[PDB]
């Protein structure tokens, strides 16, 4: 019925269900275009659908929790690049060579005692 992909990228959680068909997209109970309005990074995690030509092989149901607007986006990018290699384990071809797999450990750093914002050191004489 579905195809499932676990997505995260920097304190974000994006649960995807590549339920086949037309290509309509809902996250958290609304069209992808309603939620993600304004955003130009918002077109998007539907790009893994552009690495296996399947804009017209899948509608989408997604749940998402954490981080922010464009930080959630990169989660569904791991959530749509995983829900396609699950459907066709022969589709990681043109997915990891196209770099849509993996999961970026690019996390915001612990603020350091002394440096005003992790590294932005105090001004001295």
């Amino acid at each position: 019925e579905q195809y499932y992909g676990t997505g995260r990228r920097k304190e974000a959680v994006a649960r995807v269900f590549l339920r086949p068909g037309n290509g309509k997209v809902t996250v958290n109970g609304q069209d992808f275009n309603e939620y993600f309005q304004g955003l130009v990074r918002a077109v998007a995690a539907l790009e893994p659908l552009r690495a296996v030509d399947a804009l017209g092989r899948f509608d989408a149901y997604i749940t998402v929790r954490g981080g922010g607007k464009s930080g959630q986006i990169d989660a569904i990018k791991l959530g749509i690049a995983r829900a396609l290699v699950q459907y066709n384990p022969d589709y990681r071809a043109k997915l990891k060579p196209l770099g849509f797999l993996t999961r970026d450990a690019r996390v915001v750093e612990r603020k350091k005692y002394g440096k005003h914002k992790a590294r932005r050191a105090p001004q001295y004489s």
């Binding site: 304004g38 955003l39 130009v40 990074r41 077109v43 998007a44 790009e47 464009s70």
Partner: protein, 155 residues
């Protein structure tokens, strides 16, 4: 990079035209990280390359880059006890950064009301031979060659 060659990062394409040089101008239009505001101002002004002088927002940008990219520059070096500005060919990577940057500066300084309004205008005029970044490109270039007296004072 006393040690290494200092890694050159590739950029993303831009979802709208899939161009790694369109992300490179929008990053230099950026301010305070607010990239969502950085991106409108292109397509706000790309629309201004389309409304005014009906053409190709893809191609007026890519010309305005080659119309501000400086092939010869001069950096000052210390010899004897002298401050000689050395004639050198500015590398292609230096060019990109050099082209885009003057392009934001010259545009920001413009006497027009909205940000993109300037951005477009400048891009148009750069390809047309007459911009603010276009003066600056010739300034550096003829600042060089005026200084070819220091050509073997080049590394």
């Amino acid at each position: 990079a006393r040690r290494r060659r200092a890694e050159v990062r590739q950029l993303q394409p831009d979802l709208v035209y899939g161009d790694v040089l369109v992300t490179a101008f929008i990053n230099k239009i950026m301010r305070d990280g607010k990239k969502n505001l950085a991106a409108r101002i292109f397509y706000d002004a790309c629309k201004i390359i389309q409304e005014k002088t009906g053409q190709e927002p893809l191609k007026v940008f890519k010309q305005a880059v080659e119309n501000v990219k400086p092939r010869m520059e001069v950096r000052s070096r210390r010899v004897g006890g002298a401050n000689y500005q050395v004639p050198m060919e500015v590398s292609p990577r230096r060019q990109q950064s050099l082209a885009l940057r003057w392009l934001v500066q010259a545009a920001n300084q413009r006497p027009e009301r909205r940000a993109a309004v300037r951005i477009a205008h400048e891009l148009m005029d750069a390809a047309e031979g007459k911009g603010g970044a276009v003066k600056k490109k010739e300034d550096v270039e003829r600042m060089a060659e005026a200084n070819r007296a220091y050509a073997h004072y080049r590394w």
